A paper describes a structure:
GmPOPB is the macrocyclase responsible for macrocyclization of amatoxins, eight amino-acid ribosomal peptides with the core sequence IWGIGC(N/D)P. Amatoxins are cyclic peptides further modified by a characteristic sulfoxide cross-link between tryptophan and a cysteine, and hydroxylation (the extent of which vary). GmPOPB is an unusual enzyme catalyzing, depending on substrate length, proteolysis, or macrocyclization using the same catalytic machinery. The protein contains two domains as observed in other POP enzymes. The domain containing the putative catalytic residues (Ser577, Asp661, His698) comprises residues 1–81 and 450–728, and the other domain is a seven bladed β-propeller, comprising residues 82–449.
In order to obtain co-complexes, we mutated each residue of the presumed catalytic triad (mutants S577A, D661A, and [name]) to ensure inactive protein. Crystals were obtained for the 35mer complex for S577A and [name]; with the 25mer substrate S577A and D661A. In the crystal structure of [name]–35mer complex, the hydroxyl of Ser577 is in hydrogen bonding distance from P10, in a position suited for nucleophilic attack but the structure is less ordered, notably the loop containing the mutation [name]. The histidine loop is disordered on the [name] mutant structure and the H698N mutant is insoluble, hinting at a stabilizing role for His698. His698 is 12 Å away (much further than in any other POP) from Ser577 but is essential for catalysis rather than binding. To confirm the importance of the putative catalytic triad for GmPOPB, the mutants S577A, D661A, and [name] were evaluated for activity, and were inactive with both 25mer and 35mer substrates, using 5 μM GmPOPB and monitoring the reaction progress after 24 h.
Author numbering:
A (entry chain A): 6 to 221, 230 to 727
B (entry chain C): 2 to 14, 19 to 35
């Protein structure tokens, strides 16, 4: 490779004209509009670009060595928290190490396993996703046992399609290589197609389940009910709104069997309607009477549980950091009260009801999760896992006398803690399982939180992870991760590949809690959203400058990475930041054409985050931010490796194709390589790639960064 | 589970290194 040898890329004379509130009518040239399409020309272009990318990566001998390291780092047993079904047996996911999909196990005995004995020694295979297709192409995207434990509904995604299909099987009929070989697949006849952007919500009678489907872009979503032991033609439409075709739907059923809840969403903002229907014992039928409790888009509402007509709801109504309210439905005009009040400086992230009347709450304080147990009277009884530092979730069923916590972070691979209400008061909390890694020692790695100041004076926290031998003396390379949007928190997470990269090169890993995320609630999201979106980039750029300025990383040795909205983040950041701010950039499946994002698949919902390009006022703040339309001819770009999957239906690969073509046109003689790596396996909706393929891709990405920053293997 | 979060521009159900979601996969299966 040398500068100025990029593929021949035709520049059309397509021009789109937009309305600007300040500038009037603005003609915007789109010479790579043709890269929106699926044609022979585009096939030649993607082939040429991918061959050029692979050719450059072939020059790097260290990539093969990293693949060896990363495979070994991933090669360890992994497992979920177990779930007790009403048959008395415990079910959990188990991965041997490098399986592309984890396998659902079932306990041999109707008792909580001693998991130190080993998963195969304490359980048998119930459901193996890997055998859904002989070639491993079929992926289980989600699943749900019935309340009574008799059936197992599971959504399957195929390669090629943009929809999942729900199948149902008896829990006494396992899916494995043995069962497939010995007999017939073993599932029921039920085949519920066109399932998307949803979960499976069983009614508490275990007779059927609620699911969202689309008609045979995606519009006119329907909330439907499927009865077990029937075909999809017999499925009841529970709710649809042809007047608002862009709206989507969710659902929930109360544990007592009394209520059916309907959620309605108009866009990707955290605002939903909430209607409540009373079920009589024969269950969901057509003609459900909806009580319109929340009937305007104003706040977030998610049901926790109910006791009689008193409904407990996690909400951010007049409470940016979230809280728990009660709405008493016995009243004609329902009275709204705070059960657990808003904490000013901690986001209420999750609340589950446990042992019928208690509440387990997860608070996120300075982007670090804290777990508490509350009584029925709203009294904070105790803090659980007080010395834990990372991200946490709850796993339980309301009626049972236990719950679990799944705990992880930058150097906590996976701890599963159990709380048992039946034990003596001092002995209730315990550790069920701790995840054991391979080669790495998590104790060799330190994570700290440091604060830096953005351009506007706002103070922003940032996680810094390093191998403990690495010094903050202005010599280390840095890898800066970000997402920056949609109230998605950039939480701590265990990555054996990242830690392996840090130990190998003595680099550091950085995660600034930039505005746009939901680390500090609604106001933090509002601070990097729509007209304020530029703050997200300023926060992210300031983070990188702070790392160099304060001697965490060496000058020009900050690489940046991000996926999807994180791709937009990195692509916009290289365009906007000063020359030499970054030493490498890796956008993965990113948004980039912010003038046309809303024209493709489910992009129209993201107007909540980016604004509407068709509105003149909003065009005026989108246009200057759009990465595709702000590339210059006078700024040296860092070494860039763009990655996309050609079958990506979430973010059309269009976005990345236009950006790389625009980069290559504007700075053809850039001293650093501007490449795009294009995977041509049409990966289905809600899938990982194969494990070996992930390892290879990781080795490419991290090797490219290593070489771009001039890092050698010791 | 978050219905509205399943259609975000995000990697998988926030980074490429989140590849393994086995730890949390058994949290809400019933």
């Amino acid at each position: 490779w040398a500068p100025g040898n990029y593929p021949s890329t035709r520049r059309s004379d397509h021009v789109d004209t937009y309305q600007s509130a300040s500038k009037g009518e603005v003609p915007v040239p789109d010479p790579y509009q043709w890269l929106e399409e699926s044609t022979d020309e585009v096939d030649k272009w993607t082939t040429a670009q991918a061959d050029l990318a692979q050719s450059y990566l072939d020059q790097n001998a260290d990539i093969q060595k990293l693949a060896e390291k990363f495979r070994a780092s991933r090669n360890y047993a992994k497992f979920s928290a177990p779930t007790l079904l009403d048959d008395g047996h415990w079910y959990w996911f188990y991965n041997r190490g490098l399986q592309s999909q984890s396998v659902l196990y079932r306990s041999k005995e109707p008792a909580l396993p001693d998991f130190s004995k080993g998963d195969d020694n304490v359980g048998d295979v119930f459901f193996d996703p890997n055998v859904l297709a002989a070639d491993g192409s079929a992926g289980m995207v989600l699943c749900k046992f019935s309340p009574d434990g008799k059936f197992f509904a599971y959504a399957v995604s195929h390669l090629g399609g943009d929809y999942s299909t729900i199948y149902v099987r008896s829990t006494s009929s396992p899916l494995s290589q043995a069962s497939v070989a010995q007999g017939v697949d073993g599932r029921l006849s039920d085949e519920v197609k066109w399932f998307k952007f949803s979960t499976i919500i069983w009614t508490k009678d275990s007779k059927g389940f609620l699911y969202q489907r689309y008609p045979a872009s995606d519009r006119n979503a329907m909330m439907c009910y499927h009865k077990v032991g029937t075909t999809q033609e017999e499925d009841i439409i529970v709710y649809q709104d042809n007047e608002h075709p862009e709206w989507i739907y969710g659902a929930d059923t109360s544990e007592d069997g009394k209520y059916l809840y309907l959620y309605q969403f108009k866009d990707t903002s955290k605002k939903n309607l909430l209607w409540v229907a009373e079920l009589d014992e024969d269950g969901v039928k057509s003609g459900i009477h909806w009580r319109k409790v929340v009937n305007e888009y104003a706040a977030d509402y998610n049901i926790i549980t109910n006791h009689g007509s008193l409904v407990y709801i996690k909400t951010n109504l007049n409470a940016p950091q979230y809280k728990v309210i009660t709405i008493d439905l016995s009243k004609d005009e329902p009275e709204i009260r705070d059960f657990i009040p808003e904490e000013k400086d901690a986001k209420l992230a999750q609340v589950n009801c446990a042992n019928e009347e208690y509440f387990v709450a997860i608070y996120k304080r300075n982007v670090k999760d804290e777990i508490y147990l509350y009584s029925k009277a709203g009294v904070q009884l105790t803090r659980l896992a007080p010395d834990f530092v990372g991200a946490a979730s709850i796993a339980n069923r309301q009626k049972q006398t236990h719950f679990f916590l799944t705990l992880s972070g930058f150097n906590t691979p996976g701890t599963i803690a159990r709380y048992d209400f039946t034990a003596p008061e001092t002995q209730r909390f315990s550790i069920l399982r701790t995840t054991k890694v391979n080669e790495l020692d998590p104790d060799d790695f330190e994570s700290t939180q440091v604060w830096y100041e953005s351009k506007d004076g706002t103070k922003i926290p940032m996680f810094i992870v390093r191998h403990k031998s690495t010094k903050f003396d202005g010599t280390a390379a840095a890898i800066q991760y970000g997402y920056g949007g949609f109230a998605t928190s950039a939480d701590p997470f265990f990555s054996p590949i990242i830690l392996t990269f840090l130990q190998t090169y003595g680099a550091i890993f950085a995660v600034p809690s930039i505005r746009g995320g939901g680390e500090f609630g609604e106001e933090w999201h509002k601070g990097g959203r729509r007209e304020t979106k530029v703050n997200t980039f300023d926060d992210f750029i300031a983070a990188a400058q702070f790392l160099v300025k304060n001697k965490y990383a060496a000058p020009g040795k900050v690489a940046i990475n991000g996926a999807s909205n994180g791709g937009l983040l990195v692509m916009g950041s290289i365009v906007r930041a000063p020359e030499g701010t970054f030493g490498a950039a890796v956008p993965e499946g990113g948004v980039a054409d912010l003038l046309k994002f809303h024209k493709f698949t489910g992009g129209q919902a993201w107007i909540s985050e980016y604004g509407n390009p068709s509105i003149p006022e909003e065009f005026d703040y989108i246009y200057p931010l759009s990465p595709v339309h702000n590339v210059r001819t006078d700024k040296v770009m860092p070494a860039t490796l763009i990655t996309v999957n050609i079958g990506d239906g979430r973010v059309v690969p269009m976005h990345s194709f236009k950006f790389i073509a625009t980069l290559q046109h504007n700075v053809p003689q850039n001293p650093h390589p501007l490449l795009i790596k294009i995977d041509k396996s049409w990966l289905g909706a809600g899938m990982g790639k194969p494990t070996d393929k992930n390892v290879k891709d990781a080795a490419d990405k991290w090797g490219f960064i290593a070489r771009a920053l001039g890092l050698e293997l010791k | 589970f978050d219905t509205n979060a399943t259609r975000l521009p995000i990697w998988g159900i926030w980074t490429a290194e989140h590849v393994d979601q086995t730890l949390a996969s058994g949290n809400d299966i019933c």
